[PDB]
């Protein structure tokens, strides 16, 4: 008796910005699904985040490295913003080796078949000396939510990075009148999502709907 929605369009505005159209929707269902999906997308989407760094010759973040523009703290903060999509495993170790003057960016990370750098232009640090060289081992783990390093339950030199696993950055939804075959009371939901580029928008929508359905399974047979 209810007209169920369909995924009808996915407008990839940019690599990290997309719009997903759900149609048709009954009265009231547009806002209900909009808010439910917005909350689930903002809180529950899994992603890959940098969790551990090992820079050669570095003992702690509160130190400098000769020939490097940034402090170790700022390098770690830059690595925290590194957006990576890992395929086929929940944990990977990337290697970064660079020498000579120039910006050390995400494109300089040693290529791995199962790892993809969505934004190669992400600057990690800057080498300012001809003889300066930087070598680091970056641990990337899969997770969801926000896991601070302080709350995580190791030799000296392994620097813990706060993990913000969520790939979703901004969620907006709009409910607009959708021209139905005959009916004029149906609507459509346009969900605009801005991410870090590591999640497929259709994958995100299906993941959020699956989470909502699994959470509803308790209510569907109440006891």
């Amino acid at each position: 008796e209810f007209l169920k929605p369909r995924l009808v369009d996915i407008e990839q505005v940019s690599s990290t910005h997309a719009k997903v159209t759900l149609e048709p929707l009954e009265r009231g269902f547009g806002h209900t699904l909009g808010n439910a999906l917005r909350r689930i997308l903002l809180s529950s989407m899994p992603g890959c985040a940098v969790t551990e760094v090992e820079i050669d010759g570095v003992l702690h973040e509160y130190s400098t490295k000769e020939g490097v523009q940034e402090d170790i703290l700022e390098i770690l903060l830059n690595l925290k913003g590194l957006a990576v999509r890992v395929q086929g495993k929940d944990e990977v170790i990337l290697t970064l080796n660079k020498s000579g003057i120039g910006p050390v960016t995400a494109a300089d990370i040693t290529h791995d078949g199962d790892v993809e750098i969505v934004k190669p232009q992400h600057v990690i640090c800057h080498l300012t000396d001809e003889n300066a060289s930087i070598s680091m081992r970056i641990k990337v783990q899969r997770g969801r939510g926000y896991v601070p390093a302080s709350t995580r339950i190791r030799p000296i030199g392994r620097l813990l990075v706060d993990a913000c696993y969520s790939p979703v950055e901004r969620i907006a939804y709009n409910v607009e009148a959708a021209r139905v075959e005959q009916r004029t009371d149906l609507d459509k939901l346009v969900i605009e999502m801005e991410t870090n580029g590591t999640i497929d928008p259709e994958e995100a929508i299906r993941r959020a709907a699956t989470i909502l359905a699994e959470q509803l399974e308790a209510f569907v047979d109440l006891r």
Partner: protein, 78 residues
């Protein structure tokens, strides 16, 4: 007698002294939490007078300075 700074502290397990060096002074860069020993010191009676991290002051060791009186054999850490 004189107070001794050393890694040989009585009534403590080896796990509690893993962050100390041979001299008994915490390594640079060690991640310490409340109760962890920074400088192992024994006062003769020996009793445990080692400097410990204050409770809930978990932090990183970023610098260690040693000041030695004249005529005193400075340790290997020094």
């Amino acid at each position: 007698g004189p107070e001794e700074i050393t890694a040989d502290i009585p009534n403590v397990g080896e796990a509690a002294l893993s962050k100390l060096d041979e001299s008994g002074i915490v390594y640079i860069g060690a991640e310490v939490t409340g109760g962890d020993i920074l400088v192992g010191k024994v006062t003769p009676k020996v009793k445990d007078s080692s400097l410990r991290v204050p409770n809930g002051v978990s932090g990183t060791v970023i610098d260690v300075q040693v000041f030695t009186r004249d005529g005193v054999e400075k340790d290997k850490r020094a």
